[PDB]
Amino acid sequence: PLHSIISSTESVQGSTSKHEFQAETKKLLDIVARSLYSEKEVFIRELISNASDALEKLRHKLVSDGQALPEMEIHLQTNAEKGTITIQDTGIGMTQEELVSNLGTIARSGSKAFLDALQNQAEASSKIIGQFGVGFYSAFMVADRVEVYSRSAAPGSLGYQWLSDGSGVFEIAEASGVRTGTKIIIHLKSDCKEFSSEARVRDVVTKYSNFVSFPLYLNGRRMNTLQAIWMMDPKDVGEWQHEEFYRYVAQAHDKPRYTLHYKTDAPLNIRSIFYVPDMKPSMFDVSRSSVALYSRKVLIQTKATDILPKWLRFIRGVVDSEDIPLNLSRELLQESALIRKLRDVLQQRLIKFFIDQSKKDAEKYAKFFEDYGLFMREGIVTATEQEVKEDIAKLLRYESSALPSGQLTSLSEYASRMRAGTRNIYYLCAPNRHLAEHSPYYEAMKKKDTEVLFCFEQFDELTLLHLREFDKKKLISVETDIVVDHCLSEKETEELMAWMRNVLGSRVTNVKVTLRLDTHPAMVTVLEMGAARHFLRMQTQEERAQLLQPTLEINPRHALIKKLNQLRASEPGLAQLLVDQIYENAMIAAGLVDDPRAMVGRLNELLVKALERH
Amino acid sequence: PLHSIISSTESVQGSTSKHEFQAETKKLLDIVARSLYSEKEVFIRELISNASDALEKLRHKLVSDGQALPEMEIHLQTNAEKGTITIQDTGIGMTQEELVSNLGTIARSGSKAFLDALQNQAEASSKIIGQFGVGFYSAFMVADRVEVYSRSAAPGSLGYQWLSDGSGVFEIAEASGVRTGTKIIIHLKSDCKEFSSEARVRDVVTKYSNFVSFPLYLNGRRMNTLQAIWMMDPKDVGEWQHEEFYRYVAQAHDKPRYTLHYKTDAPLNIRSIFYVPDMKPSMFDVGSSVALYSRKVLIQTKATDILPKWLRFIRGVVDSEDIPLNLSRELLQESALIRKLRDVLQQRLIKFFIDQSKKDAEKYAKFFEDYGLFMREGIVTATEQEVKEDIAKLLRYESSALPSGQLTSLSEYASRMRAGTRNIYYLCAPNRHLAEHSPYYEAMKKKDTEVLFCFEQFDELTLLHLREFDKKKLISVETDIVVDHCLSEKETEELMAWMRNVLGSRVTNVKVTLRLDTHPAMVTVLEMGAARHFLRMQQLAKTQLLQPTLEINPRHALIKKLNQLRASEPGLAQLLVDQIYENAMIAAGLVDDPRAMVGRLNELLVKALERH
Amino acid sequence: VIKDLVPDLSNFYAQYKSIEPYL
Numbered sequence A: 001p002l003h004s005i006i007s008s009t010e011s012v013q014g015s016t017s018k019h020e021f022q023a024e025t026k027k028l029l030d031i032v033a034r035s036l037y038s039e040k041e042v043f044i045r046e047l048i049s050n051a052s053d054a055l056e057k058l059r060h061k062l063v064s065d066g067q068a069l070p071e072m073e074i075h076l077q078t079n080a081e082k083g084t085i086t087i088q089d090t091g092i093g094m095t096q097e098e099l100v101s102n103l104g105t106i107a108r109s110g111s112k113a114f115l116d117a118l119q120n121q122a123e124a125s126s127k128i129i130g131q132f133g134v135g136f137y138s139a140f141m142v143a144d145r146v147e148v149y150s151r152s153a154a155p156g157s158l159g160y161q162w163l164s165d166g167s168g169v170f171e172i173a174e175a176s177g178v179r180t181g182t183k184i185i186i187h188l189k190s191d192c193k194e195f196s197s198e199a200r201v202r203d204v205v206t207k208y209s210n211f212v213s214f215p216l217y218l219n220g221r222r223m224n225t226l227q228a229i230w231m232m233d234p235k236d237v238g239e240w241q242h243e244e245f246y247r248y249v250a251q252a253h254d255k256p257r258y259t260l261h262y263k264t265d266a267p268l269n270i271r272s273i274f275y276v277p278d279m280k281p282s283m284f285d286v287s288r289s290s291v292a293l294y295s296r297k298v299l300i301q302t303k304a305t306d307i308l309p310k311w312l313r314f315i316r317g318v319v320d321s322e323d324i325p326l327n328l329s330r331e332l333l334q335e336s337a338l339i340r341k342l343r344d345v346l347q348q349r350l351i352k353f354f355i356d357q358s359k360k361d362a363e364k365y366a367k368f369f370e371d372y373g374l375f376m377r378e379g380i381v382t383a384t385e386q387e388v389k390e391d392i393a394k395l396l397r398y399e400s401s402a403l404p405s406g407q408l409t410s411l412s413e414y415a416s417r418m419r420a421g422t423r424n425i426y427y428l429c430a431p432n433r434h435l436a437e438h439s440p441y442y443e444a445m446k447k448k449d450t451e452v453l454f455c456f457e458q459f460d461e462l463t464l465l466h467l468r469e470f471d472k473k474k475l476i477s478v479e480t481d482i483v484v485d486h487c488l489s490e491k492e493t494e495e496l497m498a499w500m501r502n503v504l505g506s507r508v509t510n511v512k513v514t515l516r517l518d519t520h521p522a523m524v525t526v527l528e529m530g531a532a533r534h535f536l537r538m539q540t541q542e543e544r545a546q547l548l549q550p551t552l553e554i555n556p557r558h559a560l561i562k563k564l565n566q567l568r569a570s571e572p573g574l575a576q577l578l579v580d581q582i583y584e585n586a587m588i589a590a591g592l593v594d595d596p597r598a599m600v601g602r603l604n605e606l607l608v609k610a611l612e613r614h
Numbered sequence B: 001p002l003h004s005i006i007s008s009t010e011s012v013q014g015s016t017s018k019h020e021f022q023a024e025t026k027k028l029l030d031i032v033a034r035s036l037y038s039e040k041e042v043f044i045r046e047l048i049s050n051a052s053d054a055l056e057k058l059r060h061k062l063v064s065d066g067q068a069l070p071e072m073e074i075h076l077q078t079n080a081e082k083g084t085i086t087i088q089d090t091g092i093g094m095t096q097e098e099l100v101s102n103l104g105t106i107a108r109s110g111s112k113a114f115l116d117a118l119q120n121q122a123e124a125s126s127k128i129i130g131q132f133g134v135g136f137y138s139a140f141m142v143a144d145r146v147e148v149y150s151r152s153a154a155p156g157s158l159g160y161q162w163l164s165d166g167s168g169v170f171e172i173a174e175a176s177g178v179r180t181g182t183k184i185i186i187h188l189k190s191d192c193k194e195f196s197s198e199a200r201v202r203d204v205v206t207k208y209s210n211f212v213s214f215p216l217y218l219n220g221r222r223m224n225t226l227q228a229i230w231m232m233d234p235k236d237v238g239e240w241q242h243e244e245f246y247r248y249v250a251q252a253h254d255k256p257r258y259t260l261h262y263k264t265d266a267p268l269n270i271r272s273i274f275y276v277p278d279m280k281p282s283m284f285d286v287g288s289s290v291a292l293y294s295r296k297v298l299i300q301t302k303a304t305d306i307l308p309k310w311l312r313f314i315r316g317v318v319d320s321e322d323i324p325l326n327l328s329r330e331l332l333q334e335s336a337l338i339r340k341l342r343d344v345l346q347q348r349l350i351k352f353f354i355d356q357s358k359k360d361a362e363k364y365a366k367f368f369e370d371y372g373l374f375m376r377e378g379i380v381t382a383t384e385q386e387v388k389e390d391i392a393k394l395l396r397y398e399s400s401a402l403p404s405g406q407l408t409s410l411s412e413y414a415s416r417m418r419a420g421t422r423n424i425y426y427l428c429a430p431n432r433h434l435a436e437h438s439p440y441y442e443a444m445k446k447k448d449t450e451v452l453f454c455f456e457q458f459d460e461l462t463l464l465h466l467r468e469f470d471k472k473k474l475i476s477v478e479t480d481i482v483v484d485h486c487l488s489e490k491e492t493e494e495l496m497a498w499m500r501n502v503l504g505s506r507v508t509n510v511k512v513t514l515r516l517d518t519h520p521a522m523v524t525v526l527e528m529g530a531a532r533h534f535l536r537m538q539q540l541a542k543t544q545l546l547q548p549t550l551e552i553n554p555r556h557a558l559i560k561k562l563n564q565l566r567a568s569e570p571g572l573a574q575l576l577v578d579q580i581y582e583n584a585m586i587a588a589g590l591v592d593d594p595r596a597m598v599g600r601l602n603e604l605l606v607k608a609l610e611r612h
Numbered sequence C: 001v002i003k004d005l006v007p008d009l010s011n012f013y014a015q016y017k018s019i020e021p022y023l
Ligand SMILES: Nc1ncnc2c1ncn2[C@@H]1O[C@H](COP(=O)(O)OP(=O)(O)NP(=O)(O)O)[C@@H](O)[C@H]1O
Pocket: A046, A050, A051, A054, A089, A091, A092, A093, A094, A102, A103, A108, A109, A110, A111, A112, A129, A130, A131, A132, A133, A134, A135, A136, A137, A181, A182
């Protein structure tokens, strides 16, 4: 069933004509005002941007000739009674020809011509936002009437008037009393009157245009009050400025424990600033990137592209980049190659910065780790490439047996002090270092003369098993090492073995004797012990025993096992409770108990009849 | 002070001119080619849409003529040797004037003009996709040159050739041998040659426009083979093709246990189908394969979540001819229509689950055992109380007044409760065997009030966040006990003084309870439900303690043993007291990681059996 | 198999936001 109608039989017959592409301006205005911007409030964000652009242009016109610089400010006025919003700038302005060519032509931007006329592309090319030519028409999203008083900064220009109802036709005229620059009056729509309120305009400006290059006033009072410290050199910004900027961006009243100021240009233009907070991460921090994109000092509002890896969501800051590709809606182009390389560069930069911070201050980095280790663990368990795995794992800090309590150690320094030819890193998980030292697995492991890391946090063995390799050395837990590795009389021991296997057949698939234990009555070993511990939390007792294979081990030298010999015959009934309690204790010590609430009654009725002789 | 430069001294004196808006097409083509579509592969989809539109138009023309319906289909050809991609449709076709008017004008679409001549808006408006007029120029994102051989369906129109290199200038000519319809040749760019491979084109076609209303062929073979069953009536669609469609959309191989066909027009045009898989939810499950469609083409928003987060366990498709779209044919983020669609879908799915529970007790019970965690998550993440109660109506629990194995909802629980009673009691335990023997349940065995039993995790949190059902508060058994208002008194006080001395740091307050029969001790806190989960979170993630009141049972043998134990083995008596406190904390669920308890238990047991 | 299960633990803040009003 493979048939096609594709053929090359067609050919040109008549003389070829020639035509020029046209454009339906009415439908273009409809598209811009209805089906371009998801958020209705961006119209001022464009306009303010335009204002800044104009001012930037004026600065060039006052730098090339080297003359005096008058006041350069942007003004927002709100008239609830008239239902209007006014955006005024003292920038270059626009003449008759400039108003007709720029305002009257869709996708025609005077900024692009201005940038191409710089002949340097180093002063205003990085500070001009307008690049499409449709930003102004977003004003028609909310306005049934746009009224522009524009006059140029040229010595002898005239005030000019520009009315448009947004219906594909606009009128122009000569106006008197117009101040140098451009003042746009927007008459709000019936349903868009909410933009004729002080609070809404203030919210939008603090959402989009806080860090414009020029002072910005709303209804009379300046509302910027905070320069963008991510633009100048890191040496020129102080600790107080860093703290204030962190307080603004993170919406928190504390200070940043870590500050990074990255400024790179060889791979791509990145001016980023990041802060790791002093306070412990909050519950909101764990839930999902807390870093705001900026392009020419205006917000992008991605909120979905994740310019920063998810595990690095605990840091707060900004990223500025003039190279990112923006769509017509002035939003980030999803799944862009440039944004992916930006994310990778930022991730590697932050990993390197954390490594240098660890080298610089041991105690401060130890505090940072005990605060934010869950994020690095999540990054390890969620990464794909082994290089990223190792880079994040270099940030881990686990205290080991070879060092005193409370002295955390890295994986790299642990590997730097192993034996000559052992490619094995051993880790043991316990709630506390005291239990780790007194863990049955560690006591069995004491036969081997090696150093073992101690893990106390949740999802830590899971992190180590996901890492699975560091510095070309395999990661094997103590339980896994015990499994993979290959008093009482013999007759009494064997008969006790048979009795326990008979009375624990359903729950234990194999019982054996371990002479490596000294202070623990019993041990539980599993093939994939680390994987089993995590799987048990994801998915009566025989149900888990089927897929767990709880290999039980007993120590004949322990007091309970020794007393079991007389407890099996004198009162065989209590011996069943005793061995069940020993099995449950070994289960709990192994971490293979979903909830110990079931064994409480068994333990209580063991205690009531165990010490009744007293 | 305030510094403002806004004034009103300005005035108009000049003559008012009049101009028409212009648009330079070079920058418009540039914007469409680079800064419009995030994905480079969407262009064929647009082309396919165009093809579909053309075919649709032709169909309507034949409806206007009442003549025989010829074969109409979309053919896709891929030439890796020539590095070209061709899309041919047998639609209406375009004349030279039509080619110039439509192809040569930005934002000018013949589909809208055709719709304005429909005068019914139901015959073809539900199937016409083109609405902007820039879809064709997406072909320039990948093409260094585009040819269009178009012959109109009119009886006597000649073929026309349309060349464009995408630099704002295009040429037209008379073409001979062109069959009826439109054949678009695209010569791929140097860096965009991946579209000259059959595999990539097939993947993109199946991803975006697999459910086009007309047959679609790539390199000769047809890959539709499956009609859009969400458009036909629920009675017409059968179970076999229901299973086939579910397997396609969910990329699974099982059958759907629940199938919902929702079709409404009064609030907004919704044609959706939803499937609940037979298998238990996967770990990845915990766009959710509910991808939004519009005029039988994928929107691929992947961010708005047209369906609530907890309703991610269901698969299927949603179609709406009225959802607003970006110029890039993407969903408008945070739109009122989309939010109302999400609310309507959530309400309809809640109603459907309620109806399924009414019409099948055991099947819905199995489904709840399979997907109860999603409803609990929805209750946890919900904000409106009415939504909270609507989702809670889906919860199934087993109570103390009913035999083991059967589950009931909160509605039928409150239907059988006493009129004077105005609260719902719930107790959390891993199994019903432990719940019946739980010290907290035994404490309320004095009263006859029914109590629900919760086994799965996060049920206590779910009932806590619910906090009300049918204007009835939800009070946990532990909370009810704490809010409530053989070891003679002197000996009991003397023993309790020592217990306070040895448990001063841990047990903030200790008292005697008279409602225990089998459990030596109990641990209670005011925020028991909240604390039991806050402790789990604290031991789970290091993010940003409690005052446990301990109650002893005077009639218990273990507690009675402590008087004679203190005078003989004070150290072992202290060990027993610590073990009793640990057991009470474990039963309360407030215990930490119990690995530390094992050592103390063994140190107790080594000497507690030194009497045989 | 288990390593690739990538446990979600999503809406992890919502549970604490639920807990807050009770206390
Ligand atoms: N307030 C203003 N003062 C001076 N010139 C302005 C002002 N607003 C707009 N213009 C000019 O009018 C042109 C059209 O505006 P606009 O649509 O914003 O283009 P753009 O801003 O350069 N590109 P975009 O990123 O889409 O906004 C601009 O490029 C400027 O040259």
